[PDB]
């Protein structure tokens, strides 16, 4: 697992364009926010991602990049990304390598057997250390957007 | 690796609505067209499904049913189904059970490590026997739509 003191597990996932994205390596020096979401094309996940899209400027200010992660395939995540005018990166963890690594692998009672991510948020600092964690078993609850921003800002100052 | 004459491997996958669908048990009597496609939201698969969509009249009067199968999650496939006004059912082989059972598991040259279906078409008769087969590793080629229609007609007349 990932705990509030450990370096963030180094993972390599492909984005909606099929470009490899190395986390946290490719983001040394800047604060990164990993937003794990259950399934693309769902009310709550759409809302959550749209919310991050909208606050995109606030994040640019503090040199912070938000990355969405779901076990969905790249092609669907791409379609998902465009339809909601999302402009931060979205990567496909199709082998569940990330959900497992970050210990947020779960299952929807309604779709047993389908392994997906529990809506969670992880903020990694400029040095690749996890400094904030939030996980919800209930996929209807959204993150504490404000609390996240505050932490991103505080982390950006070090 | 199924072949002409064999009994269609029984598979149970959920549809865009999360309802289990069983093939070819649930369709004993009718002729079924299994349309395996690599991925939702891609030019060639979007074209191929659209083609079956537009010729659903011809199928429903020889009493045949077309079924879409991809390893995409039910959520994405749903959005995929609606956004293209698709009518026939589309099931999710999220655990590659059917692609393996039918021997059509593979990868897109464009994305190594992602196991998906090779675009392929299987035509099961009224008794559940595989009568027509077509597979293409090249994710670029489309099926022989008329050749499929001919076969479905001939098979319905038994
Ligand atoms: Cl969700
Ligand atoms: Cl495709």
Kindly summarize this structure in a few lines.
The structure is a homodimer of 158-residue chains. The first copy, chain A, is an alpha+beta fold.
Topology:
Two copies of one chain form a homodimer.
Chain A (H helix, E strand, L loop, with lengths): L10 E5 L4 E4 L7 E6 L6 H12 L1 H6 L2 E7 L3 H10 L6 E3 L4 H5 L3 E3 L7 E3 L2 E5 L5 E6 L9 H12 L2
Parallel strand pairs in A: 3-4, 4-5
Antiparallel strand pairs in A: 1-2, 1-5, 3-8, 6-7, 8-9
The complex binds chloride ion (CL) (2 copies).
Question: How would you describe this protein?
Answer:
Two copies of one chain form a homodimer. The first copy, chain A, has 158 residues and is of the alpha+beta class. Chain A has one domain: Glutaredoxin (3-Layer(aba) Sandwich), CATH 3.40.30. Chain A contains five helices and nine strands. In chain A, strands 2-1-5-4-3-8-9 form a seven-stranded mixed sheet. In chain A, a hairpin with a 5-residue loop joins strand 8 and strand 9. Chain A is globular. At the A-B interface, helix 3 of A face helix 3 and strand 7 of B. Bound molecules: chloride ion (2 copies). The site of one chloride ion has 7 residues of chain B, from helix 1. Chains A, B: It comes from Saccharolobus solfataricus (strain ATCC 35092 / DSM 1617 / JCM 11322 / P2). Chains A, B: Keywords: Oxidoreductase, Redox-active center. Chains A, B: One of its GO terms (molecular function) is thioredoxin peroxidase activity.
């Amino acid at each position: 697992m990932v705990e509030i003191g450990e370096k963030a597990p180094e993972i390599e996932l492909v984005d909606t364009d099929l470009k490899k994205v190395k986390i946290p390596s490719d983001f040394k020096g800047k604060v990164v926010v990993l937003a794990f979401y259950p399934a693309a094309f769902t009310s709550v996940s759409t809302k959550e991602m749209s919310t991050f899209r909208d606050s995109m400027a606030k994040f640019n200010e503090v040199n912070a990049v938000v990355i969405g992660i779901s076990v969905d395939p790249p092609f669907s995540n791409k379609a998902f990304k465009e339809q909601n005018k999302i402009n931060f990166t979205i990567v496909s963890d199709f082998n569940r390598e990330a959900v497992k690594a970050y210990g947020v692998a779960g299952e929807l009672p309604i779709l047993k057997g389908y392994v997906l991510a529990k809506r969670s948020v992880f903020v990694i600092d400029k040095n690749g250390i996890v400094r904030y964690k939030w996980v919800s078993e209930d996929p209807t609850k959204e993150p504490n957007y404000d609390e996240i921003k505050d932490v991103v800002t505080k982390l950006s100052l070090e």
